Amino acid sequence: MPSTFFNLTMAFSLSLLGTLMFRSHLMSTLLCLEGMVLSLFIMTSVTSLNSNSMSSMPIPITILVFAACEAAVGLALLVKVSNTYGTDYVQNLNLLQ
């Protein structure tokens, strides 16, 4: 289990480096952002499962339910952006300078 947890944790860091190093299209980011939620969901489920801690399984899912809406909001902002610029490049989001 410890080895698998290491992989999942680095997966989250590789997904961390991704969302903290943008490149053009935002939908990539939001997509990356989701890669973390999967890694968190997998790790939470894994330890809960090998701790036989059934009282906590509710969490693995609460994490997904909140993460899904979180993403819903994220995509509506994205659609709003390629309606105002139509190209969804993190590049044009600089009016606030």
Partner: protein, 92 residues
């Protein structure tokens, strides 16, 4: 495993067919409704995920709380739907 055996035969059968196929014959996002629908879909999906444990939860000793909870979830989402049907939503 037993399942693996079946599945890899399943992929093999399909990859075999595509190969044979190749080897033998020798931008407007107008419909944010589209997007809207799709937003709904997950909100409903996620909701399903909350309802998916109900078969195990039926056997819960409480029962009263089970139903009280489940009925509240179904009702609040349906109201979400209702408001999708009040403004210009779900009317593509």
């Amino acid at each position: 495993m037993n399942l693996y055996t079946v599945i890899f035969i399943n992929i093999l059968l399909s990859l075999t067919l595509i190969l044979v196929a190749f080897w033998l014959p020798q931008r407007l996002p107008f419909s944010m409704k589209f997007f809207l629908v799709a937003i709904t879909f997950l909100l409903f999906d996620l909701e399903i995920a909350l309802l998916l444990p109900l078969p195990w939860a039926i056997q819960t000793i409480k029962t009263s709380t089970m139903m009280i909870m489940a009925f509240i979830l179904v009702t609040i989402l349906s109201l979400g739907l209702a408001y999708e049907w009040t403004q210009k939503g779900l009317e593509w």
